[PDB]
Design a binder for this molecule. Structure first.
Ligand code: 0PL
Ligand code: CL
Length: 289
C-alpha cells in the first residue's frame, strides 16, 4: 500500500502501540492499540490486512509467550483475533507466500523451535509444515521467488551465521551459503534479487553491517553499513528502498529510522519513531479510513 506500520515492541516493558509512518509526508499516526502488549513479534500483510504474529508480553505482572495471530483492518481501525498457532513463538520470523503466512521458529520459555507452520486466511487455520534443519529464535525471514528463507538467529546455545531455504512444493528445507556474519535479531528482507540481512547481535556486539545474498550467485556480499548499530530492529521495503526501525544499540532503545538506497549504496536518517523501542513488528499497507 502506502504506510509503514510498526506494531508492539519493547521499552521498559512490552508495548501495544500501533503507529503508521507516511514516507510521502513524514507524518506519524497513532492507531488502535494491540489487544495484548507484545515484543519479539513479527508483522506481515495479506490482502491489505496487517497481521501481528507471536511475540511475548513482558509485563510487570508476568511474562507470557504469545501464540496469537491478530488481524488489523486499516478500513475499520480495528484488531480482530485469528486462530492461534500450535505453539507460542517469541522472537519469531514470518514470511508470506501465495497469501499464506509462514510462522518460523521463535521460543516458548527455554524451548527454541525449529518448527514452522502455515496460516491460511481463507479458512482461519494453521498447519505445521516441515521443520527447519536448525532451531532459530531471533530469526530473519524473507520470501524471494516464492521460496522462504530463514536467516541467522539463536539456537539455544550459539548465535548463527547459517541460513536455509524452504521449497514449498517439496515441503523441504535445505541449507544455503552461510552469511559472513553471525546475526541474531537482524532485520531480514528482500530487494530485487537479493536477501538482505541488516544488523543483529552476535553474543558480544550489536551490529551495523549489512550483507545480501544473491540467489543466482549463492554468495553474500557486504553493502554500506547502517548509521546505527542495532539488534531486534524492524525492517521493511517501501518503494524499492529498505527501511529499518528502532532496535537496541547496547546503550539506547533507538527511535532512529534509516533508509537504504541500493542505487547509491547509502543509508540516510529519515524520521524518528515517536519513542525509542526494539523488537517491533513492521509491515506496509494502505492508509487507514
Ligand atoms: C531485544 N528484543 C528481543 C530479541 C532478542 C534477540 C537476541 C536473542 C539472542 O541472540 O539470544 C538478542 C539477545 C540479547 C541481546 C540482543 C539480541 N541485543 N543485545 N542483547 C543484549 C533477537 C530478536 C529479538 Cl526480537 S526485544 O526488543 O523484544 C526485548 C528487549 C528487552 C527485553 C525483552 C525483549
Ligand atoms: Cl524476550
Amino acid at each position: 500500500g502506502r504506510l509503514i506500520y510498526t506494531a508492539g515492541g519493547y521499552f521498559r516493558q512490552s508495548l501495544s502501540y500501533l503507529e503508521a509512518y507516511n514516507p510521502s509526508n513524514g507524518s506519524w499516526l497513532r492507531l488502535a492499540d494491540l489487544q495484548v502488549p507484545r515484543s519479539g513479534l513479527a508483522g506481515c500483510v495479506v490482502g491489505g490486512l496487517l497481521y501481528a504474529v507471536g511475540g511475548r508480553n513482558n509485563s510487570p505482572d508476568g511474562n507470557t509467550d504469545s501464540s496469537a495471530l491478530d488481524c488489523y483492518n486499516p478500513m475499520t481501525n480495528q484488531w480482530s483475533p485469528c486462530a492461534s498457532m500450535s505453539v507460542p513463538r517469541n522472537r519469531i520470523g514470518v514470511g508470506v507466500i501465495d497469501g499464506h503466512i509462514y510462522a518460523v521458529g521463535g521460543s516458548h520459555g527455554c524451548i527454541h523451535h525449529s518448527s514452522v507452520e502455515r496460516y491460511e486466511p481463507e479458512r482461519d487455520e494453521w498447519h505445521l509444515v516441515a521443520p527447519m534443519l536448525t532451531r532459530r529464535i531471533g530469526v530473519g525471514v524473507a520470501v524471494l521467488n516464492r521460496l522462504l528463507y530463514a536467516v541467522g538467529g539463536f539456537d539455544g546455545t550459539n548465535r548463527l551465521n547459517s541460513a536455509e531455504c524452504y521449497y514449498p512444493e517439496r515441503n523441504e528445507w535445505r541449507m544455503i551459503t552461510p552469511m559472513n556474519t553471525i546475526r541474531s535479531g537482524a532485520g531480514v528482507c528482500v530487494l530485487h534479487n537479493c536477501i538482505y540481512a541488516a544488523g543483529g547481535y552476535d553474543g558480544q556486539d550489536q551490529l551495523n553491517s549489512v550483507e545480501r545474498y544473491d540467489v543466482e550467485t549463492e554468495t553474500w556480499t557486504f553493502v554500506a553499513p547502517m548509521r546505527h548499530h542495532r539488534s531486534a530492529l524492524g525492517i521493511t521495503v517501501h518503494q524499492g528502498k529498505i527501511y529499518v526501525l528502532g532496535g537496541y544499540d547496547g546503550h539506547t532503545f533507538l527511535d532512529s529510522v534509516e533508509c537504504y538506497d541500493p542505487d547509491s549504496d547509502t543509508w540516510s536518517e529519515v524520521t524518528r519513531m515517536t519513542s525509542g523501542r526494539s523488537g517491533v513488528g513492521v509491515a506496509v499497507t494502505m492508509e487507514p479510513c
